[PDB]
Amino acid sequence: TCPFYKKIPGTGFTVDAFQYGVVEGCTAYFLTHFHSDHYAGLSKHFTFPVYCSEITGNLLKNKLHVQEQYIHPLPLDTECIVNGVKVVLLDANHCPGAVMILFYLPNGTVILHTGDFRADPSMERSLLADQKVHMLYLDTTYCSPEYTFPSQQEVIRFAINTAFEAVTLNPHALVVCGTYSIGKEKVFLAIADVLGSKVGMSQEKYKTLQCLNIPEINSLITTDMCSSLVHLLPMMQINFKGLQSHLKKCGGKYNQILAFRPTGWTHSNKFTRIADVIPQTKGNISIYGIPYSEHSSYLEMKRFVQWLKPQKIIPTVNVGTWKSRSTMEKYFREWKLEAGY
Ligand code: NI
């Protein structure tokens, strides 16, 4: 049964609710992004209208085989009427195709559902500038002040400079990057661009990247592993065993691996600056964990919410414990007292 924080009152709509069977009264199912916790339940047998971005619709059709007749892509930044209700999709600054949804309810209430997002000051100059929001359904993944991490641009700078130095010292080194979902493609694209290489990967991952509308993608990726000195592997293989095993397969072309594991936040962020990050090393294999986040930091979240000044906040992450819910409610009240709304 579908939880309350996935229903949009006064409409026939749900958000990210495909794992509960036929939801009573639902006439349109929105999907914010193509991450498995959010799409859980969709397949070729789904027969209700799905509303989403163009990129999410390419992935639903090619990766999950949802039939074309049930996929309803909407452009971004454009007022659209769905089942008699005005909606807008906005870029969420999460993974490719990820959106926030603005719903203009028939009674005059305005609701923003962030989906998963990484808040940014640029959002203060979207269509959100124009009007008031009564209810915010908020991605609270990192809603506590201990959650700190650098800008995506600083993280990419560290990865490019690390990879370029290593391969210039040793032209026989291979670079490997872990993946387990869409998102964070800049990590492997930026490293391959500095090295003058295409990125090599499995047929299944190539298929997924081909759905993402990335400009000039045919110039950037390939399924021919041997031609490439940046390889992608599933995240579970990014360990000394899995990497040893991979180096055997390359036929004595390489004598060293440098590997990257993009994570979210880890507690080593509490002590160590990005500049000062060091790898784990066994023999000719080194592994870097790098804190490349596609969710808001605490500070980014607080800035967004203090700017938007919503009347009510409904968290969508960390909702399962009383301690999490109480902690989040305290910070919402500080933010409101500090800013005066
Ligand atoms: Ni996500």
Side-chain angles (χ1 to χ4, degrees), residues 1-23 25-203 205-215 217-240 242-247 249-269 271-281 283-311 313-341:
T1 54
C2 189
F4 76 95
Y5 74 79
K6 299 182 179 268
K7 292 180 182 164
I8 304 301
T11 59
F13 302 154
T14 57
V15 180
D16 299 348
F18 302 84
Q19 65 164 304
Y20 307 105
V22 181
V23 180
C26 190
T27 52
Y29 295 74
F30 286 78
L31 183 55
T32 68
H33 70 292
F34 195 78
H35 278 162
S36 59
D37 278 1
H38 298 257
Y39 68 72
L42 269 165
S43 69
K44 73 161 72 167
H45 306 297
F46 201 82
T47 47
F48 297 97
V50 180
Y51 290 82
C52 64
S53 68
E54 174 181 355
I55 290 162
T56 298
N58 296 341
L59 290 161
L60 289 182
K61 177 182 166 184
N62 295 285
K63 297 292 286 197
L64 295 184
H65 308 287
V66 176
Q67 301 165 44
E68 197 132 273
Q69 75 172 140
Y70 304 108
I71 309 168
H72 294 266
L74 307 175
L76 302 185
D77 305 317
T78 299
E79 295 182 323
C80 292
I81 310 298
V82 176
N83 291 0
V85 179
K86 177 162 70 167
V87 305
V88 174
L89 300 187
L90 304 165
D91 207 290
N93 190 41
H94 185 49
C95 65
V99 301
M100 312 191 291
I101 312 162
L102 252 196
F103 297 98
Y104 291 84
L105 264 44
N107 68 10
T109 300
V110 177
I111 295 175
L112 175 63
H113 195 304
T114 65
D116 281 349
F117 86 139
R118 184 160 184 179
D120 194 73
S122 64
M123 294 170 177
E124 304 168 19
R125 291 172 287 283
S126 63
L127 305 203
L128 293 174
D130 304 43
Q131 101 282 285
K132 170 180 196 61
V133 172
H134 299 82
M135 315 206 82
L136 178 61
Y137 287 67
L138 176 63
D139 169 13
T140 41
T141 293
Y142 297 125
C143 187
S144 192
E146 75 274 23
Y147 300 117
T148 64
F149 36 73
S151 65
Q152 291 177 165
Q153 196 277 327
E154 292 173 85
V155 174
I156 290 303
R157 178 91 285 194
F158 172 86
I160 288 164
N161 286 6
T162 303
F164 183 74
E165 163 160 327
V167 171
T168 302
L169 291 168
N170 181 194
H172 301 275
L174 177 64
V175 180
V176 183
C177 290
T179 183
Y180 47 25
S181 62
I182 66 169
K184 313 188 183 185
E185 287 78 14
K186 192 67 172 175
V187 178
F188 54 84
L189 296 171
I191 290 167
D193 169 85
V194 79
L195 302 179
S197 181
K198 297 190 174 184
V199 183
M201 56 196 71
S202 69
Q203 295 182 256
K205 187 75 182 177
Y206 183 91
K207 182 175 186 191
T208 300
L209 296 185
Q210 283 295 157
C211 300
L212 309 183
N213 290 343
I214 291 170
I217 191 62
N218 296 333
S219 70
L220 311 172
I221 60 177
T222 189
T223 52
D224 182 10
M225 307 293 293
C226 284
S227 78
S228 152
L229 63 136
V230 180
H231 299 173
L232 302 190
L233 289 182
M235 198 75 84
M236 291 199 70
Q237 194 155 9
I238 310 302
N239 45 67
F240 298 121
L243 294 163
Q244 278 166 195
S245 174
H246 188 71
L247 189 56
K249 295 157 209 155
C250 299
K253 209 166 189 302
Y254 311 107
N255 61 11
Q256 184 187 348
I257 286 176
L258 186 121
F260 297 91
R261 291 185 338 88
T263 63
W265 172 91
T266 71
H267 181 66
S268 58
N269 280 272
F271 306 127
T272 316
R273 285 185 140 61
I274 187 56
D276 301 327
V277 165
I278 68 161
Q280 282 197 255
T281 297
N284 63 347
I285 309 186
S286 291
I287 307 176
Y288 285 87
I290 62 177
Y292 191 92
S293 183
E294 294 182 340
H295 297 271
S296 314
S297 75
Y298 172 86
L299 291 166
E300 288 162 356
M301 192 191 300
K302 176 176 179 281
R303 172 181 172 136
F304 179 76
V305 171
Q306 287 180 314
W307 169 84
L308 193 71
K309 304 179 168 50
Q311 285 185 0
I313 308 177
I314 302 163
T316 64
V317 189
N318 303 309
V319 302
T321 75
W322 296 112
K323 178 189 200 190
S324 281
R325 292 188 143 296
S326 186
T327 292
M328 290 184 295
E329 290 181 358
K330 278 165 42 255
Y331 288 129
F332 305 148
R333 177 64 65 183
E334 298 178 2
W335 301 348
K336 177 179 164 89
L337 290 168
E338 179 181 29
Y341 55 102

